[PDB]
Amino acid sequence: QPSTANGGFPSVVVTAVTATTSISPDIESTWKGLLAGESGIHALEDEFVTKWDLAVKIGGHLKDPVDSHMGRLDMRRMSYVQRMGKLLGGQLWESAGSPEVDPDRFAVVVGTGLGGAERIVESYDLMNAGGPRKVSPLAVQMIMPNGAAAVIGLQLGARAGVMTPVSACSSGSEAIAHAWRQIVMGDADVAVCGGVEGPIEALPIAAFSMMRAMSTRNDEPERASRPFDKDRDGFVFGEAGALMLIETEEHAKARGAKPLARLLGAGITSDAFHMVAPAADGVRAGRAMTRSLELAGLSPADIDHVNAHGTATPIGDAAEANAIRVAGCDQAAVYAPKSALGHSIGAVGALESVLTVLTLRDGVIPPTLNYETPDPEIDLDVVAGEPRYGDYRYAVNNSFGFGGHNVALAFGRY
Amino acid sequence: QPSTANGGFPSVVVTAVTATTSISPDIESTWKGLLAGESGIHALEDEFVTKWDLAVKIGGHLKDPVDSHMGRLDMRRMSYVQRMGKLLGGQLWESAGSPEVDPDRFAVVVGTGLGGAERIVESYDLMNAGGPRKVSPLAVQMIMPNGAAAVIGLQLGARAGVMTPVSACSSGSEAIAHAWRQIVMGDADVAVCGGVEGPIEALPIAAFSMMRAMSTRNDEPERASRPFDKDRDGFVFGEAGALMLIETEEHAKARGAKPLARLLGAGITSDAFHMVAPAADGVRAGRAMTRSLELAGLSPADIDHVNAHGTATPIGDAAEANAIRVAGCDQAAVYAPKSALGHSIGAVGALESVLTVLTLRDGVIPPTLNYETPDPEIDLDVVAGEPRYGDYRYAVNNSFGFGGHNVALAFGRY
Ligand SMILES: CCCCS(=O)(=O)Nc1ccc2[nH]c(C#N)c(C)c2c1
Ligand SMILES: CCCCS(=O)(=O)Nc1ccc2[nH]c(C#N)c(C)c2c1
Ligand code: NA
Ligand code: NA
């Protein structure tokens, strides 16, 4: 059975990362802020909060709005997630040294939770007011959920596949999983992968809050997201998009790229339990972690760090604690970055994969914010208080999306 | 290098198929109708055509509407594509003999072009009229594009992954590709895969017709879809959904399932050329065909049949003719089923994959309708007139989606 450890799969490395978050548009500045204990989560100042008297009045908008970088033309020819994708794609490529790769060995895999959905409403309104010829010839390419990945593949010249997985909260991690597959099956040597997602607005808040999925701790916004804490009361939105460049180790060495980490394996399973609730027993989610280890060639004792899905819902954190135990990883140092960055749905698995890479690169886990009275029924080694510097050799990033989609990514220190 | 032919990949077989089309709700009846020269494409009788005086007044609605099978509860708890998925999922499982499989070795991969998008508008309207608490607690799970795959995975108990690829016209074929990967990489032994898509409506017609992508031959609706014909003028919508059951040959043999065909390999490439136009040179699309042959262990001389993407746009059919030549497959007998069934976007690649299976099973290709004055600039062996009975050993199904997504699936006779 092939594994990364035994050479059955080629070695794959992470050579560049980019992200925009509620803390910073610069991933290295986001990382510094996380280590400093900063939160991106604040009182929402948008008019729509008071217009609807929303129960949720907190969240993290991007520190640097995407459209502050978008001129008239981009504002008219692309949906929001496409604009975010174009922005991050160009940033990532610059960070990688603008390499000249073989387009025929270059893939793009970018997940997203929904797609260009605001352009559906706009086209709907345009046609209602002016008839069918008032719909733009660009409407289809803006609306289609593959649109962000297509924009990035066209921008950077990727001709070895342009793929868009949709799996709610696990979309951005699943994209990295499929990019890894595209390389280890031999279809590509280099891939841009990750996830993008739209911004906080009234209808997204209404839809998730009517599930009772969201925190309503509006008086202390930075204290609201409390993964694994006894007093947690749901997730907080925190906007993001994130991409990484992965490539075979031989490809990286041949162009002088310095790896940040190794991407060793990916496990994809499903709960088949409930359309939005995770399975309480954590068994299939744990199996995704185990599968990523099988493909990497690691045992659970090797896993020093888990970057938790950790949304801070009551049932989600409990299920994940069971999952981590099921996978034999409950001695790992656990970080729940949604404590600081919130939940960005189709982007968040990619963002947390980038954070996992940085933890391995720098030998440090930032503190899980708001972990103050640990839930008596969960017993994980949650990093908290201040960053924990440690000898982290291998890590798993978890993302368990609504719908029952479990993705685990196994990374190693380079 | 592993191939199906040399044993590096396990043998994978197709053991059950289901589809709903503009000709019939019964795939075997659809097949009989195609062989009889029937078209599913008629004058649209919907009020929305006259309300907007749409330039396109033709298309194929499902012969048997999905919602004629949906009671009050399903109409309130699922989006349209989810209702179609539940319908086809249960039909497929019954056709397969309702097997008892290991949930932990059972995956679902279902592509779609857009998702539960009508529920976005509905939630939008509900909140505008009644505030945030009038949005349903079910809105998120109905809207999310992974929703149809999630419904099917929950219905049938698939715990080895539930995935949703989005790649416009190639979504349903890409789903079958990823299911094949999930099996040959060892993550699953059996998978339900295919694609679902929404119905014809005024806004979809307006959006694609403003690209000049659609036929306007309204006076002779069954004559409008003319792939590879000199007089073609764009595609016609024809509603569909389709699923197939695939599994390792050893799994099929162990439960007494009789294979309909072998699924031998899958190639995924991309054009990185234009957001909606295919590359004229057909090179990357041809490479998807070549890649499917490499993974199968076939040479182009083995390919007896190509089930063309064949949408009947001027530029699409020309590009595909170049693609087929680039791949060395231009001596294959070509069928363009959109001539009879129209284009169903995220479902159509799955539907045409089912048709490819039936061609191999039965040794017959139905006639490409409306192929009467072949385009002088395209020289393919298009089957036409009446069905061609022939010794078809291997076939490739092509799907080249808007965005530049190329998927080719290589199938073999069992
Ligand atoms: C972190 C927040 C997640 C919100 S989301 O999950 O609802 N996704 C999502 C996707 C595309 C979107 N386009 C637009 C516009 N205009 C919005 C508001 C928008 C929202
Ligand atoms: C063969 C036709 C393809 C049309 S589509 O590509 O526009 N897709 C698509 C997807 C979901 C949809 N939900 C609803 C509703 N109500 C519609 C009209 C609808 C349409
Ligand atoms: Na994580
Ligand atoms: Na086809």
DSSP string, B235-255: B-BB-EEEEEEEEEHHHHHHT
Domain end residue (candidates: B210, B230, B264)? B264
Q: Could you give the CA distance from residue B299 to residue B1 in angstroms, rounded to a whole number?
A: 15
Contact at 8 Å (CB) between A155 and A185?
Answer: no
Q: Could you give the CA distance from residue A26 to residue A84 in angstroms, rounded to a whole number?
A: 14
How close is the nearest chain A Cα to the Cα of B226, in Å? 23
Structure-determination approach: X-ray
Distance B204 CA to ligand 2 centre (A): 7
Question: Does ligand 2 have an atom closer than 6 angstroms to the CB of B344?
Answer: yes
Residues 6+ apart with CB under 8 A from B118: B79, B80, B198
Element holding A262 (H helix, E strand): strand A261-270
Q: Could you give the CA distance from residue B146 to residue A165 in angstroms, rounded to a whole number?
A: 9
* Distance, C-alpha A386 to centroid of its chain: 23
Residue B35 burial class via C-beta count within 10 angstroms: exposed 0-12, middle 13-18, buried 19 and up: middle
Q: Could you give the CA distance from residue B21 to residue A384 in angstroms, rounded to a whole number?
A: 57
β-strands A333-335, A305-307: how paired? parallel
Q: Could you give the CA distance from residue A110 to residue A179 in angstroms, rounded to a whole number?
A: 9
Domain end residue (candidates: B264, B287, B304)? B264
* Both tokens assigned to A396: 């798993």
Q: Could you give the CA distance from residue B54 to residue B384 in angstroms, rounded to a whole number?
A: 31
Whole-number Cα distances in Å, A260 to A163, A175, B95, B130, B234 = 24, 19, 50, 50, 49
How close is the nearest chain B Cα to the Cα of A75, in Å? 16
Task: Return the percent helix, strand and coil in chain A, to nearest 5.
Answer: 40, 20, 40
**CA angle B201-B202-B206, nearest 5°?**
125
Q: Could you give the CA distance from residue A407 to residue B12 in angstroms, rounded to a whole number?
A: 25
Question: Looking up tokens 């284009």, which residue turns up?
Answer: B343
* Both tokens assigned to A332: 């790992």
Element holding A85 (H helix, E strand): helix A80-95
- Of A120, A121, A187, which is closest to B268 when you measure between CB atoms? A187
Judgement on whether residues B25 and B166 belong to the same structural domain of the protein: yes
Contact at 8 Å (CB) between A413 and A277?
Answer: no
| Nearest residue in B to A292, CA atom | B187
Residue A46 burial class via C-beta count within 10 angstroms: exposed 0-12, middle 13-18, buried 19 and up: middle
Q: Which of A240, A179, A197 is nearest to A15 (CA)?
A: A179
Judgement on whether residues B343 and B383 belong to the same structural domain of the protein: yes
Judgement on whether residues A96 and A69 belong to the same structural domain of the protein: yes
B contact test, residue of A146, A176, A197 with most B CBs within 10 A: A146
Contacts 24+ apart (CB under 8 A), A68-73: none
Which amino acid does the sequence have at A352?
A: E
Torsional class of B223: left (φ above 0), alpha (ψ -120 to 50), beta (otherwise):
alpha
Which amino acid does the sequence have at A389?
A: Y
Q: Could you give the CA distance from residue B387 to residue A300 in angstroms, rounded to a whole number?
A: 58
Q: A157 vs B272: CB contact, 8 Å cut-off? A: yes
Q: Could you give the CA distance from residue A192 to residue A90 in angstroms, rounded to a whole number?
A: 11
Q: Could you give the CA distance from residue B18 to residue B199 in angstroms, rounded to a whole number?
A: 18
Q: Could you give the CA distance from residue A353 to residue A178 in angstroms, rounded to a whole number?
A: 14
Contact at 8 Å (CB) between B78 and B151?
Answer: yes
Judgement on whether residues B373 and B232 belong to the same structural domain of the protein: no
- Of B114, B159, B206, which is closest to A272 when you measure between CB atoms? B159
Q: B181 vs A186: CB contact, 8 Å cut-off? A: no
Judgement on whether residues A101 and A120 belong to the same structural domain of the protein: yes
| Nearest residue in B to A9, CA atom | B185
Residue A157 burial class via C-beta count within 10 angstroms: exposed 0-12, middle 13-18, buried 19 and up: middle
Q: Could you give the CA distance from residue A225 to residue B367 in angstroms, rounded to a whole number?
A: 61
Q: Could you give the CA distance from residue B360 to residue B354 in angstroms, rounded to a whole number?
A: 10
Whole-number Cα distances in Å, B399 to B24, B72, B268, B269, B368 = 22, 36, 10, 11, 17
Judgement on whether residues B75 and B196 belong to the same structural domain of the protein: yes
Inter-axis angle of helices A348-362 and A171-184, nearest 10:
70
- Of A138, A144, A186, which is closest to B403 when you measure between CB atoms? A144
User: For residue A107, which residues of chain B lie inside 8 Å, CB to CB?
Assistant: 270
Ligand 1 cavity residues, CB under 6 Å:
A 80-81, 113-114, 117-118, 197-201, 204, 237, 239, 344-345
User: For residue A148, which residues of chain B lie inside 8 Å, CB to CB?
Assistant: none
Judgement on whether residues B209 and B354 belong to the same structural domain of the protein: no
Q: Terminal CA-to-CA distance of chain A, rounded, Å? A: 24
Q: DSSP label at A331?
A: T
Domains held by chain B: number: 2
Judgement on whether residues B269 and B255 belong to the same structural domain of the protein: no
Q: A55 vs B402: CB contact, 8 Å cut-off? A: no
Q: Which of B170, B377, B172, B174 is nearest to B280 (CA)?
A: B377
Residue B263 burial class via C-beta count within 10 angstroms: exposed 0-12, middle 13-18, buried 19 and up: buried
Residues 6+ apart with CB under 8 A from A5: A264, A296, A297, A298
* Distance, C-alpha B375 to centroid of its chain: 25
Contact at 8 Å (CB) between B393 and B413?
Answer: yes
Element holding A118 (H helix, E strand): helix A118-130
* Distance, C-alpha A260 to centroid of its chain: 18
Does residue B343 have an active-site annotation? yes
Judgement on whether residues A237 and A334 belong to the same structural domain of the protein: no
- Of B127, B166, B181, which is closest to A164 when you measure between CB atoms? B166
Q: Which of B164, B96, B314 is nearest to A167 (CA)?
A: B164
Question: Looking up tokens 């129960």, which residue turns up?
Answer: A55
Q: Could you give the CA distance from residue B141 to residue B147 in angstroms, rounded to a whole number?
A: 6
Q: Which of B260, B271, B254, B363 is nearest to B309 (CA)?
A: B271
Other Cβ atoms less than 10 A from the Cβ of B45: the count is: 9
Q: Which residues surround ligand 3, an ion (CB under 5 A)?
A: A 307, 352, 397-398
Boundaries of domain holding B410: 265-414
Torsional class of B59: left (φ above 0), alpha (ψ -120 to 50), beta (otherwise):
left
CB-based burial, A53-62: b 16+ in 10 Å, e otherwise: ebbbbbbbbb
Domain end residue (candidates: A204, A238, A264)? A264
Residues 6+ apart with CB under 8 A from A233: A215, A216, A217, A224, A226, A312, A314
DSSP reduced 3-state for A39:
coil
Which amino acid does the sequence have at A256?
A: G
* Distance, C-alpha A201 to centroid of its chain: 19
Which CATH number goes with the domain that contains A179?
A: 3.40.47.10
Which amino acid does the sequence have at A27?
A: I
Q: DSSP label at A28?
A: H
| Sign of the torsion formed by the C-alpha atoms of B344, B345, B351 and B356 | positive
Whole-number Cα distances in Å, A396 to A299, A300, A304, A406, B399 = 12, 10, 9, 13, 36
Q: Could you give the CA distance from residue B403 to residue A115 in angstroms, rounded to a whole number?
A: 14
Contact at 8 Å (CB) between A338 and A236?
Answer: yes
Q: B210 vs A133: CB contact, 8 Å cut-off? A: yes
Q: Which of A413, A397, A380 is nearest to A267 (CA)?
A: A397
Question: Looking up tokens 């548009």, which residue turns up?
Answer: A25
Residue B185 burial class via C-beta count within 10 angstroms: exposed 0-12, middle 13-18, buried 19 and up: middle
User: For residue B157, which residues of chain A lie inside 8 Å, CB to CB?
Assistant: 272
* Both tokens assigned to A360: 């391995």
Judgement on whether residues A270 and A394 belong to the same structural domain of the protein: yes
Which amino acid does the sequence have at A306?
A: V
Q: Which residues of A are catalytic?
A: 169, 309, 343
| Sign of the torsion formed by the C-alpha atoms of B208, B213, B219 and B224 | negative
| Sign of the torsion formed by the C-alpha atoms of B140, B143, B144 and B147 | positive
Judgement on whether residues A59 and A173 belong to the same structural domain of the protein: yes
Judgement on whether residues A211 and A234 belong to the same structural domain of the protein: yes
What are the E-state strand segments in A271-379? 305-307, 333-335, 364-365
Contact at 8 Å (CB) between A255 and A190?
Answer: no
Residue A391 burial class via C-beta count within 10 angstroms: exposed 0-12, middle 13-18, buried 19 and up: exposed
What size, in residues, is chain A? 414
